[PDB]
From Swiss-Prot:
Induction: Induced during growth on trehalose. Pfam families: 3keto-disac_hyd. One of its GO terms (cellular component) is plasma membrane. Its EC number is 3.2.1.218. Its main location: membrane. Keywords: Carbohydrate metabolism, Cell membrane, Glycosidase, Hydrolase, Lipoprotein, Membrane, Palmitate, Signal. 3-keto-disaccharide hydrolase that preferentially hydrolyzes 3-keto-trehalose (3-dehydro-alpha,alpha-trehalose). Important for disaccharide utilization in the human gut. Also shows hydrolysis activity with the glucosinolates glucoraphanin or glucobrassicin, but with much lower efficiency. GO terms for molecular function: hydrolase activity, acting on glycosyl bonds. It is an enzyme of class 3 (hydrolase). It catalyses: 3-dehydro-alpha,alpha-trehalose + H2O = 3-dehydro-D-glucose + D-glucose. It comes from Bacteroides thetaiotaomicron (strain ATCC 29148 / DSM 2079 / JCM 5827 / CCUG 10774 / NCTC 10582 / VPI-5482 / E50). This is 3-keto-disaccharide hydrolase. It is found in: Cell membrane.
Length: 264
């Protein structure tokens, strides 16, 4: 029948949550292509998106020219002002995400996945929000030629599309600052693959001895950061699932064409 009815036919109900650790008790009708990718950013609104830990989108995240933009002040991990990491508030388990990203000269951001909203108790019994990165693996987003982090870590494991500070992207086929790069993150039954610019650049396996050993060699080791170790070692929590999101690392960055295929 109508264009409206055909559109409703080529759409799927996608649950989302509205605030810290809330149930996903509302749904968006989102477009799906023939390959099964759900477009999760519509080019115009933040529907389904919110700050990690928040009930709203921080004002440092804007929409511009069909992109999600983070507007940075230059303070790295500080997350000053009305910032913070952004999530699409729908937990995925087995999925393939594709999106494009572009950084400013010298810029740094990241794509998080399998994220959990985590709090801990302070000395007075009050809940405190823990960083997204103590639960969520990080796909690096970087100007590999100008941000000095590119030269740090080991074997270029802090360059774009790396599992940040843990496993390097090989080949390192990033395009330079100001150009669009294509990211792929696939999680399927614990196998994780990163892609960049239509090439697979690393592979790893969650919930294995090898994964534990990698974490024990990281800043999230059991000795250095017990809570992070516990969360990452059983990445995704009891149900092995979580949110996709993007990082406030204080620098201008743009994201577009954000789509996710649910794998079974
Ligand atoms: K929203
Ligand atoms: K980063």
């Amino acid at each position: 029948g109508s264009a409206q009815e055909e559109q409703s036919a080529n759409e799927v109900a996608v649950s989302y949550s509205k605030s810290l650790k809330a149930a996903e008790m509302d749904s968006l009708q989102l477009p799906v292509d023939a390959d099964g990718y759900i477009t999760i950013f519509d080019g115009k609104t933040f529907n389904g998106w919110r700050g990690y830990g928040k009930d709203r989108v921080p004002s440092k995240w804007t929409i511009e020219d069909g992109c999600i933009k983070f507007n940075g002040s230059g303070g790295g991990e500080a997350q000053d002002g009305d910032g913070g990491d952004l999530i699409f508030a729908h937990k995925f388990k087995n999925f393939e995400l594709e999106m494009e990203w572009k950084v400013s000269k010298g810029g740094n951001s990241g794509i998080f996945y399998l994220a959990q909203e985590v709090t801990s108790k302070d000395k007075d019994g009050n809940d405190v929000l823990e960083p997204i990165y103590i639960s969520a693996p990080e796909y690096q987003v970087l100007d590999n030629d100008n941000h000095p982090d590119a030269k740090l870590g080991k074997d270029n494991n802090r360059q774009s599309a790396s599992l940040y500070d843990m496993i390097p992207a090989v080949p390192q086929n990033a395009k330079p600052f100001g150009e669009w790069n294509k990211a792929k993150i696939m999680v399927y039954k614990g196998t994780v693959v990163h892609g960049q610019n239509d090439e697979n650049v690393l592979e790893y396996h969650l919930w294995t001895k090898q994964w534990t050993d990698l974490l024990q060699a990281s800043k999230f080791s059991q000795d250095k950061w017990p809570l992070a170790f516990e969360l990452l070692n059983n990445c995704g929590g009891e149900n092995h699932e979580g949110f996709i999101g993007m990082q406030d690392h204080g620098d201008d960055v743009w994201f577009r064409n954000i789509r996710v295929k649910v794998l079974d």
